[PDB]
Amino acid sequence: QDLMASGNTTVKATFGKDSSVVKWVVLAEVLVGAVMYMMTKNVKFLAGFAIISVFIAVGMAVVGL
Amino acid sequence: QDLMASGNTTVKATFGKDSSVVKWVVLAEVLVGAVMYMMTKNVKFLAGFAIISVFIAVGMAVVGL
Amino acid sequence: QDLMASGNTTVKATFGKDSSVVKWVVLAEVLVGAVMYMMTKNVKFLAGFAIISVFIAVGMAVVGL
Amino acid sequence: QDLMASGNTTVKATFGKDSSVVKWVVLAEVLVGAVMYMMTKNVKFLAGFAIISVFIAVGMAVVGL
Amino acid sequence: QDLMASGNTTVKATFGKDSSVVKWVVLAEVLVGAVMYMMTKNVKFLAGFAIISVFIAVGMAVVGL
Amino acid sequence: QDLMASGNTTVKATFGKDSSVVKWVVLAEVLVGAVMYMMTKNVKFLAGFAIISVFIAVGMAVVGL
Amino acid sequence: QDLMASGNTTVKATFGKDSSVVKWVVLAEVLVGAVMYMMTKNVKFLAGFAIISVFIAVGMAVVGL
Amino acid sequence: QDLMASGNTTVKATFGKDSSVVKWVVLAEVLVGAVMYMMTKNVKFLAGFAIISVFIAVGMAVVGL
Amino acid sequence: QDLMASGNTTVKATFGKDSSVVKWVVLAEVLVGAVMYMMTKNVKFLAGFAIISVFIAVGMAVVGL
Amino acid sequence: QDLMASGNTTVKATFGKDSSVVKWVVLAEVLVGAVMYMMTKNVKFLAGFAIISVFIAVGMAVVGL
Amino acid sequence: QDLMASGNTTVKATFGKDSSVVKWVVLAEVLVGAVMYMMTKNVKFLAGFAIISVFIAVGMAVVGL
Amino acid sequence: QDLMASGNTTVKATFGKDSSVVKWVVLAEVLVGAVMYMMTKNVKFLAGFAIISVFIAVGMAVVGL
Amino acid sequence: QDLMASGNTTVKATFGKDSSVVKWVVLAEVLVGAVMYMMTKNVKFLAGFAIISVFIAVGMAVVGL
Amino acid sequence: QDLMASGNTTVKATFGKDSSVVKWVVLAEVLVGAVMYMMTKNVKFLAGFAIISVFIAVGMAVVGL
Amino acid sequence: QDLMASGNTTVKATFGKDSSVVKWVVLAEVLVGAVMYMMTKNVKFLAGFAIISVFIAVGMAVVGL
Amino acid sequence: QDLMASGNTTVKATFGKDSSVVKWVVLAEVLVGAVMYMMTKNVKFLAGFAIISVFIAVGMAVVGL
Amino acid sequence: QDLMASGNTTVKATFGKDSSVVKWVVLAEVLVGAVMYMMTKNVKFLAGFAIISVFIAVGMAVVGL
Amino acid sequence: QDLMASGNTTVKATFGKDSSVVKWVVLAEVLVGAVMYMMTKNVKFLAGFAIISVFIAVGMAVVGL
Amino acid sequence: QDLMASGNTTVKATFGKDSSVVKWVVLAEVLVGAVMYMMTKNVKFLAGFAIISVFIAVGMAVVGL
Amino acid sequence: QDLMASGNTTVKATFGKDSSVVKWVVLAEVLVGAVMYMMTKNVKFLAGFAIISVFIAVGMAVVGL
Numbered sequence A, B, C, D, E, F, G, H, I, J, K, L, M, N, O, P, Q, R, S, T: 001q002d003l004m005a006s007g008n009t010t011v012k013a014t015f016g017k018d019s020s021v022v023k024w025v026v027l028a029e030v031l032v033g034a035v036m037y038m039m040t041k042n043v044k045f046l047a048g049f050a051i052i053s054v055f056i057a058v059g060m061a062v063v064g065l
């Protein structure tokens, strides 16, 4: 017979690019990277404003159904 | 006589490369490796974007029916 | 007289190398060793991709009918 | 008179080294010791690949008819 | 003759999607998930707010009468 | 003469694939696996969502009348 | 027949938004959050003053009778 | 029926603004933030003299019975 | 004829909501829940302060004479 | 007839608020929580000085004869 | 009838303020606080010389017979 | 009746000022205080030569039998 | 007539306070309490040095002839 | 009549202070406390050199024949 | 009668000062305290060369037959 | 009788001065102290070339059979 | 008359010190104590190399014919 | 009469020093001690290379026929 | 009679120097020591390239048949 | 008999020089050594470009079948 773990396209619409996961991961950096100027106060946490769209593209387009 | 544990080719189409297992294991890294910037915020969990296709190839092509 | 526990060659074709046992033991590692990155996320469970063919050879070739 | 419990050489050809007992005791370890990696996944049940031929030699060569 | 274990459509209306089981499995997570901030107080038990509708769809739509 | 234990085809229509047994074995997992997130709250009881259709196919298609 | 697990609207008025669950989950945070300034004394446990109303809205509005 | 988790207004008069919680959270800062002049002796632990009345207002006035 | 197992309404007034069974089941939790803070001392046995009135309503209103 | 499990008001005066149960459950916390400063020596077991009067009120005033 | 768990005033004279419990808890801090200056030797375990008389007053004067 | 936890005056003469506890806590400071001039070699551990008689007086004279 | 189960006052002088039962129950605690420091070695079995005289008073003075 | 459980003074001379019980309990601490420096090697099991004479006095002098 | 737990003076000559216990407790410190210079390499485990004769004198000379 | 823990003089010739323990404790210092010049490169680990013979003389010459 | 249960001195020569019971009880410890280093591998079962001759001396010399 | 449990000297030649027991206990340490360098990788299980000949000498030379 | 646990020289040829045990213990260090340069990247796990031939010689040449 | 742990030359061709282990250990350094110029940016991790071929030669040529 065939497989039974899929056939619904439910997990693809939940954990994907056009879903809600991309919104909860973009606000976690500004929650701590924009308030750490108290103790440190140094130009350090600035290389993460471009790796968000790159990590989501090299992991979602691996299989693609 | 012959064997009775197979002869249906059901588990091969369920736990394989062209199935649904490769999709449930590709989104588990972005679920935790992309949200751990709140506590650590360091370049560490970045070597897992290439070992996914390697581990699935060295285990599925062992017997191959 | 002779023995009566064998004379059919049924268990040899069921629990052997050229059967279905080698397939149910190769997918059990990827089912749990490839999804435990949510809690651990460490290079640890990687020494099992070579002990599968070794353990099956040191046990099946002991008697050999 | 003599004894009447033997004189047939039936149990010696059934429960011995050159019989079918040595085949049913070698597949019981790989049936569960090779699939218990789902819960434990540790190096524990590995000292049993040498005690099979030792236990069968210290019990069969005791009397020897 | 036919079967006698069914023919009433009683267990389908009790253990299903349009019943009361989906309401008891949705409050059990927040009952111990929203109050465990005393000892733990971390971001770990957040991946269960999307697997509720996925597990119920890969189990109820298997047979479907 | 012939046999008298069959000839009615009653147990085949009751304990089979196209009967009511396949419906009572699919809801027993969600009754306890979906509510065990209180004490455990882990990813362990997630492999039973594919072995339901596999065990029923390696047991019913053994004889087949 | 119909189901017998509901028909009383008792668990809905006990575990919901307009009940007492929303009050016991808001005091547990300040009970350990406003007193942990003796050991750590940092800015880390400050993101929980907005996720209280978000987690209760992505869980109660799932089924809704 | 209704709910049984409240209807006494006991926890509201104990863990609130006009209770005793506001008195135990104001002396914990001076117990350690004012005696750290021995090893550190710097102007650092001075931002907690205004966040006490703010954190107690954004958490107590969320529901308000 | 009719039945002879009822017609007295004796067990209904003894094992019911407006009887004495609801009183012997409400003091059994405080007898063991308020004393288990010695060896364990953990917030765990707190989910039983609402399931008492629910379990007594989903079992008594099933038949109702 | 009526019920026979009550009619004496004996268990109400023994396991209640104005009895001796409230005196035994108040000394069990100080017997072990005030002496555990040997191994732990931390501010953790301090939230139980207010939940004693709350748990006894949400369980005794449920039925009330 | 009345209660039978009290009426002797035995536990009150044993576990109280004017008993021996206040003496076994006042010397427990000096047994471990005055000796931890070897490995640590830091101003840390100094907030316990005032919470002894406070914890014994907020628990004994709760009921008071 | 009276109490049974005391009536011997044994723990008072063992853990007190006129006992042997004051001698084991006065030599433990110089055991690591006079030899820490290797790695540190700074004026730091010098304020502990006056807090020995103060901490023993504010803890022993609390109850005083 | 009267009763014939008493009238001798024999069991009262054997199983009572002023008998030998109070002596066989006071040494059984130290028999296992003073020797359990081998494997455990913890302050745990110390709450039984006061409940001996309490349990014997709330059980013997119940009837009192 | 009188009691028959005593009248011999045998258990008093066996399980008492002037017997052999005080000798078997004084060497149990040095058997495990003086050898646990191999793995732990810390000042922890040192509060037992004074509780030996105290526990034997608060249990033997309770009744005293 | 007298006691029967002693009268042989066997445990006194085995677990004492002039026995073999004092020899097995002096080599355990040098077995690990003298080889821990690999990872630690710090003056720490040096206060144990004087507490050996002190602990054995406050334990063996307690009763002394 | 006499003791049974000794009477062989085996542990004295194994863990002593004229044995093999003095040879394993002398190479562990040069194995890590003479190679730490990579990161540190400072005169610090040089006070251990005289405490080897001192620690073995204050431990072996304590009892001496 | 006299007794008939003795007068043969048979059980005394079989279950005694100068018999064979003392040999079967001394090898049972090394059979399980020298092999438990596989799973546990800890210093725990070492207190039995001295209690063998003590238990046999407090049991055989009780009556002594 | 004499004893009947011995007189064959069979268990002495099987469970002794000059037998096969000393060989099965010397290879059990290297099977588990030389493989724990994977997860732990520390110097801890190195004290067993001298206690093998000591434990076999203090147990075999106890009686000696 | 003689012993029956040996007489085959099977365990000596399996667990010895000239067998397969020396090969499985020499590759376990490079499997985990040559890959730990990711998280640590320090010269620490380099003392095991000489203790392999030493530990195998001090355990195999103990008895030697 | 002979040994049964080898006789296949499988682990030698898998964990050796002319296999795949030498390739997975050479890319692990450039994965972390070429990217650590962010936080550190110093010439420190440059001693690993020569110890790769040395460590693989001092461990593989130890036995050599």
Ligand SMILES: CCOP(=O)(O)OC[C@H](O)CO
Pocket (backbone or CB within 6 Å): A042, A043, A044, A045, T038, T039, T040
């Ligand atoms: C401008 C450098 O930014 P980063 O590379 O993030 O920091 C490196 C050092 O930690 C600077 O102190």
Ligand SMILES: CCOP(=O)(O)OC[C@H](O)CO
Pocket (backbone or CB within 6 Å): A032, A036, B038, B039, B040, B041, G043, G044
């Ligand atoms: C100590 C962790 O504090 P957070 O604010 O959780 O994270 C910020 C960076 O990790 C600084 O370390």
Ligand SMILES: CCOP(=O)(O)OC[C@H](O)CO
Pocket (backbone or CB within 6 Å): B042, B043, B044, B045, S038, S039, S040, T031, T032, T035, T036
């Ligand atoms: C550079 C890639 O990440 P890692 O190898 O995990 O870095 C080591 C430390 O954890 C960094 O502090």
Ligand SMILES: CCOP(=O)(O)OC[C@H](O)CO
Pocket (backbone or CB within 6 Å): B032, B035, B036, C038, C039, C040, C041, E043, E044
């Ligand atoms: C922020 C995500 O954390 P997880 O990887 O789910 O868990 C981490 C460990 O369990 C605790 O360090």
Ligand SMILES: CCOP(=O)(O)OC[C@H](O)CO
Pocket (backbone or CB within 6 Å): C042, C043, C044, C045, R038, R039, R040, S031, S032, S035, S036
């Ligand atoms: C390095 C290969 O994996 P393992 O040997 O399982 O690592 C042990 C520790 O858990 C390291 O973190």
Ligand SMILES: CCOP(=O)(O)OC[C@H](O)CO
Pocket (backbone or CB within 6 Å): D042, D043, D044, D045, D046, D047, Q038, Q039, Q040, R031, R032, R035
């Ligand atoms: C090859 C060793 O196997 P085991 O001794 O069974 O396992 C090691 C410990 O028990 C850790 O769990």
Ligand SMILES: CCOP(=O)(O)OC[C@H](O)CO
Pocket (backbone or CB within 6 Å): C032, C035, C036, C039, D038, D039, D040, F042, F043, F044, F045
């Ligand atoms: C996340 C791993 O899940 P499983 O492998 O199913 O279980 C292994 C342990 O029991 C987890 O604690």
Ligand SMILES: CCOP(=O)(O)OC[C@H](O)CO
Pocket (backbone or CB within 6 Å): G038, G039, G040, H032, K043, K044, K045
């Ligand atoms: C006051 C008790 O000790 P801690 O909470 O650890 O103190 C904070 C830091 O240790 C200051 O250095």
Ligand SMILES: CCOP(=O)(O)OC[C@H](O)CO
Pocket (backbone or CB within 6 Å): A038, A039, A040, H043, H044, H045
């Ligand atoms: C000086 C202001 O106080 P803080 O922001 O707490 O400290 C910042 C740096 O850590 C100074 O050292």
Ligand SMILES: CCOP(=O)(O)OC[C@H](O)CO
Pocket (backbone or CB within 6 Å): E032, E035, E036, F038, F039, F040, I042, I043, I044, I045
């Ligand atoms: C947090 C509420 O209590 P539980 O759900 O019983 O917690 C699970 C573990 O047993 C915690 O120890």
Ligand SMILES: CCOP(=O)(O)OC[C@H](O)CO
Pocket (backbone or CB within 6 Å): E038, E039, E040, G032, G036, J043, J044, J045
């Ligand atoms: C510090 C407050 O007490 P608790 O909430 O009991 O502890 C929380 C963490 O476990 C700190 O360790």
Ligand SMILES: CCOP(=O)(O)OC[C@H](O)CO
Pocket (backbone or CB within 6 Å): H038, H039, H040, L042, L043, L044, L045
């Ligand atoms: C001056 C007394 O000693 P401390 O207060 O410990 O000094 C603080 C810093 O350690 C100075 O270096």
Ligand SMILES: CCOP(=O)(O)OC[C@H](O)CO
Pocket (backbone or CB within 6 Å): I038, I039, I040, J032, J035, J036, M042, M043, M044, M045
């Ligand atoms: C000092 C507390 O003693 P207990 O409550 O008897 O024990 C609690 C834990 O179980 C100790 O591990």
Ligand SMILES: CCOP(=O)(O)OC[C@H](O)CO
Pocket (backbone or CB within 6 Å): J038, J039, K031, K032, K035, N042, N043, N044, N045, N046, N047
């Ligand atoms: C004499 C003190 O004994 P303990 O309190 O058992 O040890 C101190 C801490 O527990 C260190 O961990």
Ligand SMILES: CCOP(=O)(O)OC[C@H](O)CO
Pocket (backbone or CB within 6 Å): K038, K039, K040, L032, L036, O043, O044, O045
């Ligand atoms: C230096 C004295 O020895 P210890 O008191 O054992 O160590 C104290 C601190 O841990 C030093 O780091």
Ligand SMILES: CCOP(=O)(O)OC[C@H](O)CO
Pocket (backbone or CB within 6 Å): L038, L039, L040, P042, P043, P044, P045
């Ligand atoms: C000067 C001798 O060595 P040490 O005393 O270990 O030095 C301590 C500081 O680290 C100096 O650098």
